[PDB]
Design a protein around this ligand. Structure first.
Ligand SMILES: C[C@@H]1O[C@@H](O[C@@H]2[C@@H](O)[C@@H](O)[C@@H](CO)O[C@H]2O)[C@@H](O)[C@H](O)[C@@H]1O
Ligand SMILES: C[C@@H]1O[C@@H](O[C@@H]2[C@@H](O)[C@@H](O)[C@@H](CO)O[C@H]2O)[C@@H](O)[C@H](O)[C@@H]1O
Lengths: 301, 299
């Protein structure tokens, strides 16, 4: 079964680490880096890793039951899976699938629709934020702590968190949270990735997301877009080597813009060619060319 | 080129009319209906219709500039992908626009690009009443309302929908995309079962609500992944009707069968005021090209 990439253009793709369209391709203009995101992790032959799940509108969302305590009001959410199934902390995952995979304050909206009590069917929704550095950000153990200026939430009812953007200018998108809290190490992580040779850089799909105040840039970079995650998962094409050579092509003219290594683990490297911003034709997309190996030498893009 | 469907299960699919996962399959328990949604419209050979665009998180979003300022927020629109919006495009409205009558609540946000505080941001809850006379996304403008006056005129502004802003949704009643003046144009066609005893099968989401008892139902004809799939595959339709079966991949058992119409919607044979029970690992599979005379087994 031949390996293929979606034929969606850049403006037609979704970030796999935040619910947002892709705004541009991006390489670090300073140096090469090492990164270990847990959303947006899929091997070329279709193996999901980390906390990666398939629904683009559920990335960095949470679902569960509000548990009352004992100006910002604390909201302890006892989690279930995003698809509604019970959350099992013994699963071999770093945290509930879809959990926020970086240190920062994410603002969003928490909503409820009552299923028990004297007001079944009554609803409410308000802005909240989740600080993933909080010691009670413990999505591996099955709970997260939100905060809201509103006290208008009902104890014991189904509660959903939908992320919107930066709730403070404090994002560190490549620093993993402590998914089990302060006294347990992360486990079952998708591996760290980095260029294997000097002169290469990871190529990211970058989104710029909203911010609720301050001057935060809102950058969230993913290794492959969510549509690629969905595509590889369904195709499950055998990988014929550790490295697929791909090219950004203009499908209307056949012109090759630049080449890149698509690693079997599910990320892209390019040859460094300076701090120049990346400009591609808006009708262009990546196309699989051939299976190669690590000794392939990329031409500067 | 052979026609295929994605193999994603129900809990792995996205609504094409609202940014939400699919919760269940649904048919009208009362009668057959006629519907004309403008998002989630793609023919089986990959022709997008209505206001349908490809990005699942952008459905019912708006992007634009705040021109002037419950505090009113007048937004001059661009396309969601950032390109200028041309009101003479042969579309009912800017792609992704809300395609029903109701109050949609969400968050409006800004990041300044001009003036004395370039880079400064803000974001607050807002709502958009698509029955408002100034809900005119075809002309290129929408009116939002917010409790906060912390918004900057002349700056890029984005609306992200969350759910019901009031218990006033009519998901099958199209808004007046140009206001009370002009009739709607360039609409994706109405769809309905062609025979008594058939019903449209919907992919249903239950979305949030900011107060009241609204049900939050948003039904789409095909999920957004199917839209994306048909758009890319562009497989020629060999007949007006593809036979599809909802299958259990573990057992190979056909749970039920359905007609997938070339226009991009599904009908099933009515089997009474039946709740729909399907296995969580199941998905639809293309079986064969048939025709309108195919008799579906009652669901
Ligand atoms: C840059 C501004 O950000 C927000 O305002 C801030 C307030 O929310 C508050 O945190 C105070 C405390 O220092 O700082 C303000 O800058 C926005 O509300 C405002 O419109 C600006 O974008
Ligand atoms: C069912 C309830 O809805 C909301 O409360 C409403 C208020 O926000 C306000 O609109 C008043 C107007 O009279 O009506 C209330 O019903 C929720 O905030 C509340 O928690 C209930 O779910």
């Amino acid at each position: 079964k031949p390996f293929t990439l979606p034929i969606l253009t850049l403006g037609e793709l979704s970030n796999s680490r935040f619910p947002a369209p892709i705004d541009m391709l991006y390489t670090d203009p300073n140096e090469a880096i090492v990164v270990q995101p847990q959303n947006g992790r899929c091997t070329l032959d279709g193996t999901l890793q980390g906390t990666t799940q398939l629904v683009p509108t559920q990335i960095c969302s949470f679902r569960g039951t509000l548990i009352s305590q004992t100006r910002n009001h604390p909201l302890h959410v006892q989690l279930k899976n995003l698809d509604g199934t019970p959350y099992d902390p013994t699963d071999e995952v770093p945290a509930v699938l879809g959990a926020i995979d970086f240190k920062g304050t994410v603002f969003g909206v928490a909503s409820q629709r009552n299923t028990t009590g004297n007001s079944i069917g009554a609803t409410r929704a308000h802005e909240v934020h989740i600080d993933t550095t909080n010691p009670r950000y413990t999505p591996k153990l099955g709970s997260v702590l939100m905060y809201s200026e509103s006290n208008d939430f009902d104890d014991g009812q189904p509660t959903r968190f939908t992320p919107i953007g930066m709730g403070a200018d404090d994002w560190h998108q490549w620093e993993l949270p402590e998914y089990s809290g302060h006294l347990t190490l992360n486990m079952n992580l998708a591996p760290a990735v980095a260029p294997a040779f000097p002169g290469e850089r990871i190529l990211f799909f970058r989104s710029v997301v909203p911010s609720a105040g301050g001057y935060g840039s809102g950058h969230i970079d993913c290794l492959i877009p969510q549509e690629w995650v969905q595509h590889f998962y369904q195709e499950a094409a055998p990988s014929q080597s550790a490295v697929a050579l791909i090219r950004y092509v203009n499908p209307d003219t056949g012109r090759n813009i630049f080449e890149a290594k698509l690693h079997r683990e599910g990320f892209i490297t390019v040859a460094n060619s300076g701090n120049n911003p990346i400009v591609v034709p808006p009708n262009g997309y990546f196309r699989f060319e051939a299976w190669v190996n690590q000794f392939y030498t990329l031409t500067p893009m």
